[PDB]
């Protein structure tokens, strides 16, 4: 052995990985394989391998070699493999490899070779493998290549070849592999592949071909063909005519527009066919002869019909994708025994018949989304047992059968609006993922690991509308007090025929507004009492019908009318501290405006559909009318306070003033809590829970409707006595 090597092996010396700048000395003369790659050898002197007469394999990759002496490779008559990649050879050494008649494999890739001398490759009578990729060749060396009839593999990828002339490879009768990808080829002559009768692999990817090559009708032994990532747009009718043994064709990443009808027929060895983006194709391709397909893909076309003999002719299919077409009638799929995946999304399918999916034992995945399907029979589901995924979404379904789908593991039925019935929870025991058209549909499955998409919370209860047994009691008490007290005040006020002062007048109308609020609370309590613990089948009908619209109108109309009426009362006292005629007209205008504000949300979309209570500001995750309404209410309260402050600074008169005061106050604080819950995303409000929010909204929103009359019946007495006096005197 010598200082810088291994020399350990069966006469196999390996010295790669060192900093040797020259061939080492002192090795055995019977070495049959030398590996001195990855070193700092830049030049080979004359007779540099005279101590290795029996060497057979030589590796010189990774060096900075840039000059080979013509007589450097002398006496290597047994050399068979020579590697010279990752070097800096500016040209192919023709006078240095002349005496290598036993050479079989030669690597010259990753160099800076840009010229091939015409005298090169003269003397290599046993060459089999040649590497010429990763170079700067601008043309095919036709003349040098007509000297190697025994060549079997050739690569010319990653170069700058623009076109292939006539009879370029007219002397290579043993070539089996040819690579021409990652070049700038944009034109092929007619007679350019003549003589390649044994060729099996052809690669033409990442080029600039503008038209489909007609020169491929000369390779009867061709099996694999690839021409993807080109600019081919039209495939001529009858293209693969002289290639009956094709098994793999790559044609994706091309702007295809038209494909001939009789173009892929009579290909018994093809196993796959994927075509995408063929916009100007309106007929199903002919496939009389191609009966060994395992995956068919035809999407983005204008195909409107499917031949009825698709499964009968061929029994090898596993996947089928026919999305993005104009298909509206589905032929019988009986016959495709081996079929497993079907994709038919984004079509015009309108019905599903009994025999559509009959005879599909191996079907596992089905996709029928965005097809506008509205009629599905009670069949075509029992024959497909082992099915896990069923995607039927964004359709016009009205009734979904639940027979034969007990083995599902993931169901998607989100997007339909006419399916208001409840799905049975006993028919989806094995189901694990669910999405439903309505939120309340999760109640049957999820309790009274599924993880349904709507994810019902406090605002979408399943059992109790109101909630706990306290809020329910709180809302029941508010309804029983406010209605009767308001009725007693109206009857006592609108009794005498004497002239009614405006101060005494506004009280009757505050009462009539409140009476309307008590009617809304009673409606809510009756609805809760009717459906106790069964807020599953009474939710969709309530929230998608006419009851919600009526209830929502009363809440908005009653709440907004009282605030506007209270504003006039404060101005009336301020003006008093003649004008009696204007006050009635003002009251009539306030009622008219309150009616418009209430009826405005009944016409637009998405509102009165956020909570089962149908209030306008149940957060409304509608940010119009709600935000608009809450801002208007805040501006009216600030003006009354200022006016009364003005009046603050500014017997019976003292009693009336004091009465109009308490209401500007009793009312202010509650509007306060509801409005604070409202501005939630700006301050985060220390992450208020949705249940405490619902409880606070229920307790406080109708709360003034019951405290306003009691501040006038018995508590804080001013003239109630007179009323009773006068009414009783009346009775």
């Amino acid at each position: 052995c010598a200082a810088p090597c291994s020399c350990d092996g069966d006469r196999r010396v390996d010295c790669s990985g060192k900093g040797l700048t020259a061939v080492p000395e002192g090795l055995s003369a019977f070495t049959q394989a030398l590996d001195i790659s990855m070193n700092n050898i830049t030049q080979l002197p004359e007779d540099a391998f005279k101590n290795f007469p029996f060497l057979e394999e030589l590796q010189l990759a990774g060096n900075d070699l840039s000059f080979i002496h013509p007589k450097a490779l002398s006496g290597l008559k047994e050399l068979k493999v020579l590697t010279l990649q990752n070097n800096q050879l500016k040209t192919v050494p023709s006078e240095a490899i002349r005496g290598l008649s036993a050479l079989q494999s030669l690597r010259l890739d990753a160099n800076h070779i840009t010229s091939v001398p015409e005298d090169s490759f003269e003397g290599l009578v046993q060459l089999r493998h040649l590497w010429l990729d990763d170079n700067s060749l601008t043309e095919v060396p036709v003349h040098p290549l007509s000297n190697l009839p025994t060549l079997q593999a050739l690569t010319l990828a990653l170069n700058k070849i623009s076109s292939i002339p006539d009879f370029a490879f007219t002397n290579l009768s043993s070539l089996v592999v040819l690579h021409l990808h990652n070049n700038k080829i944009r034109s092929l002559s007619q007679h350019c592949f003549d003589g390649l009768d044994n060729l099996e692999t052809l690669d033409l990817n990442y080029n600039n071909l503008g038209e489909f090559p007609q020169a491929i009708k000369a390779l009867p032994s061709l099996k694999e063909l690839g021409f993807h990532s080109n600019s081919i747009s039209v495939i001529p009718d009858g293209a693969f005519d002289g290639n009956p043994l094709l098994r793999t064709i790559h044609l994706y990443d091309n702007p295809l527009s038209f494909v001939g009808n009789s173009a892929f027929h009579n290909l018994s060895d093809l196993h796959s066919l994927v075509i995408r983006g063929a916009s100007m194709v309106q007929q199903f391709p002919n496939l009389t002869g191609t009966v060994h397909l395992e995956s068919l893909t035809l999407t983005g076309t204008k195909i409107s019909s499917i031949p009825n003999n698709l499964c009968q002719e061929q029994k090898m299919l596993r996947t089928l994708d026919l999305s993005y077409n104009n298909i509206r009638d589905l032929p019988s799929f009986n016959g495709c025994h081996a079929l497993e995946e079907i994709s038919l999304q984004r079509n015009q399918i309108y019905q599903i018949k009994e025999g559509t999916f009959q005879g599909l034992i191996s079907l596992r995945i089905l996709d029928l989304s965005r097809n506008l399907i509205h009629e599905i029979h009670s069949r075509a589901f029992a024959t497909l047992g082992p099915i896990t995924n069923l995607d039927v979404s964004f359709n016009e379904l009205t009734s979904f059968p639940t027979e034969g789908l007990n083995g599902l593991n993931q169901l998607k039925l989100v997007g339909n609006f006419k399916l208001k019935e409840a799905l049975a929870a006993k028919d989806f025991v094995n189901l694990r993922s669910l999405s439903v058209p309505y939120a309340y549909q999760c109640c049957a499955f999820w309790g009274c690991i599924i993880h349904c998409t709507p994810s019902t919370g406090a605002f979408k209860p399943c059992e109790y509308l109101l909630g706990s047994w306290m809020i329910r009691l709180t809302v029941w008490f508010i309804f029983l007090v406010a209605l009767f007290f308001n009725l007693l005040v109206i009857l006592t006020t609108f009794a005498s025929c004497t002239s009614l002062p405006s101060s005494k007048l506004f009280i009757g109308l505050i009462s009539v507004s409140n009476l309307f609020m008590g009617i809304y609370t009673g409606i809510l309590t009756f609805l809760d009492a009717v459906s106790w613990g069964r807020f599953a089948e009474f939710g969709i009908w309530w929230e998608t019908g006419s009851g919600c619209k009526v209830a929502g109108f009363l809440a908005v109309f009653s709440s907004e009318s009282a605030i506007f009426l209270l504003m006039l009362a404060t101005v009336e006292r301020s003006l008093s501290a003649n004008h009696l005629k204007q006050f009635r007209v003002a009251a009539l205008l306030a009622f008219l405006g309150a009616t418009v504000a209430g009826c405005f949300p009944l016409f637009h979309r998405g509102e009165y559909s956020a909570s089962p209570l149908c209030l306008p500001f149940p957060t409304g995750e509608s940010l119009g009318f709600t935000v608009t309404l809450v801002l208007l209410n805040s501006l009216a309260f600030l003006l009354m306070a200022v006016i009364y402050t003005k009046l603050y600074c500014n017997n019976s008169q003292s009693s009336m003033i004091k009465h109009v005061a308490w209401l500007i106050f009793t009312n202010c604080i509650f509007f306060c809590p509801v409005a604070f819950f409202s501005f939630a995303p700006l301050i985060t409000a220390i992450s208020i829970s949705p249940e405490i929010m619902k409880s606070v909204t229920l307790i406080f929103f109708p709360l003034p409707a019951c405290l306003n009359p009691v501040l006038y019946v018995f508590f804080n007495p001013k003239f109630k006595e007179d009323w009773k006096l006068l009414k009783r005197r009346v009775t």
């Binding site: 069966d10 196999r12 494999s105 690597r107 493998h129 079997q152 592999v177 690579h179 990808h181 990442y206």
Partner: protein, 100 residues
């Protein structure tokens, strides 16, 4: 130098990723094939018991690799991807028993 002896041969194969869009590469591989002078035999084991277990003393020699090295190929795919293919390159071969 019988042509049918246990020796090593070279051939070229094309490597491409099955799923990711990657450019194909042409690589050189070493293969060992031939015949060995030693023959195979199987003799009945003479057991003295009530239970018999594989009573055949087999001795068969096969042409198998002796020394090899592991080299990885950097495959360049569409966009940004550096998928790596690995294989062992055969350095030498000899005849060794299949069982031992």
């Amino acid at each position: 130098s019988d042509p049918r002896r246990c020796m090593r041969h070279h051939y070229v194969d094309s490597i491409s990723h099955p799923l990711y869009k990657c450019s194909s590469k042409m690589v050189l591989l070493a293969r060992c094939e031939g015949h060995c002078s030693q023959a195979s035999r199987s003799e009945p084991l003479v057991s003295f018991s009530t239970v018999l277990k594989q009573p055949f003393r087999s001795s068969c020699h096969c042409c198998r690799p002796q020394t090899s090295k592991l080299k990885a190929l950097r495959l360049r795919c569409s966009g940004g991807m550096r998928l790596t293919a690995t294989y062992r390159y055969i350095l030498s071969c000899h005849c060794e028993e299949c069982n031992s």
